[PDB]
């Protein structure tokens with residue numbers, strides 16, 4: 141009796157991305173003048189050697205601009221947030237408990253418009269953030285804001301970190317594939333108001349975060365068995381993995397304290413990622429008979445430019461493989477979990493714009509990586525869609 | 528090519544619970560004398576009217592004892608935690624970032640021993656807590672503590688709230704069912720060090736939390752296609768749902784602030800649950816042709832005794848239906864997400880101990896409910912196993 145229920149309950153094909161929408165806070169922060177702005181707003185103009193260090197960090201970040209909820213006015217009303225270490229979580233929480241779901245909503249509405257189907261067909265909702273926590277969570281808030289059905293099945297992924305654009309895909313794949321008819325709204329929404337803080341010359345790792353992290357949200361619609369010519373596949377998920385790199389204990393740690401979310405880097409992240417990326421690739425692609433890593437399309441969490449450069453150098457990727465990734469890093473900076481989803485959007489839009497044969501730059505198979513605390517590597521194997 | 532991959536990648540039968548293990552902090556706190564202890568340790572002996580109110584809350588809680596990581600000594604070294612509202616998150620975080628995964632480990636080792644199979648066959652790990660956040664999260668910590676493989680696929684469920692014993696089952700069901708061979712370690716671990724606080728007479732809702740919440744962890748092994756006579760099914764999952772009750776906005780809210788996690792109750796939770804439980808039952812059981820709610824076995828998150836009493840009254844459940852639920856509330860109090868998992872354990876142990884025909888009290892079909900912020904109701908339909 142259960143066998144019949146099970147066979148009738150499950151979906152049949154591969155989880156597919158059917159729509160992608162993004163959004164960012166309206167405030168555009170140029171990187172070229174950021175060092176001058178940041179050192180003034182944090183009352184750190186006298187830390188001249190540190191300021192020079194920050195300028196080099198920003199000049200080498202390969203980020204031209206970021207979008208930030210935080211403004212000069214907001215920072216002027218919250219001096220505790222402008223300090224390196226002052227009690228400020230309640231202020232930060234008040235910002236991000238509202239801004240996460242607000243920005244998420246903006247991205248989600250865009251994806252839902254693109255998908256074109258009734259929002260009442262959304263059966264599952266995954267919400268992911270590294271920016272603040274609350275109960276009921278941002279999943280409840282987004283259900284209310286969007287007018288989803290009350291019986292949507294929710295998955296609130298809090299305090300996840302930069303690899304979770306990969307984690308939400310891994311999770312959505314099982315939801316979509318094991319449930320016939322299921323349509324999963326996937327929302328990653330990240331707001332750096334929880335992490336912004338002043339500079340300290342004995343905490344340079346912390347300072348790196350201030351050059352790289354930016355805000356944004358991305359939303360997907362994921363489902364199996366798309367309805368031919370009503371729904372429009374963009375990418376298909378085939379296989380996923382998550383692993384912890386050896387010798388990386390404590391590489392990237394973030395603690396949520398009374399002073400907000402702190403960021404620490406205790407190990408060479410570019411070097412750990414580059415030494416371990418090959419093994420992740422062979423686990424994913426050896427069973428598909430593929431070993432030429434220029435023959436697949438690429439999406440890599442741009443944690444900083446050095447991760448990308450060292451990965452490219454390790455594997456001998458052509459410089460063009462990382463173009464969509466670098467274009468997102470350039471235009472938005474490191475938006476933690478949302479970044480990889482912006483990169484998927486950029487890639488399928490550019491491929492479609494330029495008349496390529498597939499959404500994956502004209503290539504069939506592709507890989508998406510997320511990198512973050514653990515040190516964790518998330519791998520998602522994708523297949524593109526014709527046109 | 529993808530069709531063949533998909534067909535080979537997926538599991539075939541219903542996600543099944545194969546092992547359950549629990550653990551609690553060693554410190555046993557009697558409820559009968561708790562009012563006297565709590566009012567002394569929080570320097571509130573002069574709040575005589577409030578103290579009488581607390582005594583009635585404890586006397587009516589139907590809780591005989593709870594296990595708490597927090598001790599008199601710990602509370603004496605942290606007066607900020609003993610206040611109703613003082614900056615104390617960093618202290619609390621330091622406790623629960625270590626205690627969550629420590630207690631989780633204890634429960635998990637027990638489940639893994641019961642299951643009897645190599646820990647290297649664990650492919651997925653779900654960790655759930657309402658107690659503190661960190662990056663890398665408690666999932667990374669438990670991977671390290673248990674010696675799981677680095678490539679275990681992790682799902683870190685933070686700041687979830689009391690319904691998430693249901694959420695982790697809903698999630699594990701899709702993971703197990705969509706992936707052939709997948710074995711999911713599921714760990715809920717809750718520690719009230721983030722929520723303990725002194726009494727305030729204008730915040731009675733907060734005070735209710737101090738009478739009811741207790742600590743504990745429970746771990747499961749979940750998988751499809753159990754290996755006959757090597758693995759031993761206990762319960763099978765068949766169908767799940769999650770919904771938001773109408774007219775319940777703001778019923779149960781928890782904010783993570785500089786003063787720790789605060790708890791608020793703005794609406795009648797027993798009354799919202801009781802008015803909406805029937806609809807959840809008909810959605811789950813009408814398609815199975817079942818309408819006699821005494822004919823199924825029951826597991827209900829014991830948020831407080833009044834939820835149980837009003838549900839029992841609404842449906843005309845026999846008083847015995849809630850015995851396993853009430854026995855867990857009596858012996859451990861409200862352990863947020865872990866509670867329902869302790870109740871499954873208690874039920875299958877009592878059924879097996881007493882020579883019943885099934886693990887679900889001799890009955891075939893059963894329901895598990897989790898209730899919490901939103902107001903959210905999670906429903907999990909279970910089938911028991913012979914013997």
Ligand SMILES: O=C1C[C@@H](c2ccc(O)cc2)Oc2cc(O)cc(O)c21
Nearest residue numbers: 301302330331332354355394403476
């Ligand atoms: O400190 C932070 C900030 C967070 C973030 C980035 C972008 C933004 O918009 C929201 C917050 O990302 C992170 C990701 C981690 O691996 C490590 C961390 O410590 C953090």
Ligand SMILES: O=C1C[C@@H](c2ccc(O)cc2)Oc2cc(O)cc(O)c21
Nearest residue numbers: 688689717718719741742781790863
């Ligand atoms: O404030 C808390 C504490 C948390 C909890 C309970 C037991 C324990 O061991 C760990 C923490 O449970 C909750 C569940 C919620 O719906 C609402 C909340 O605000 C909270």
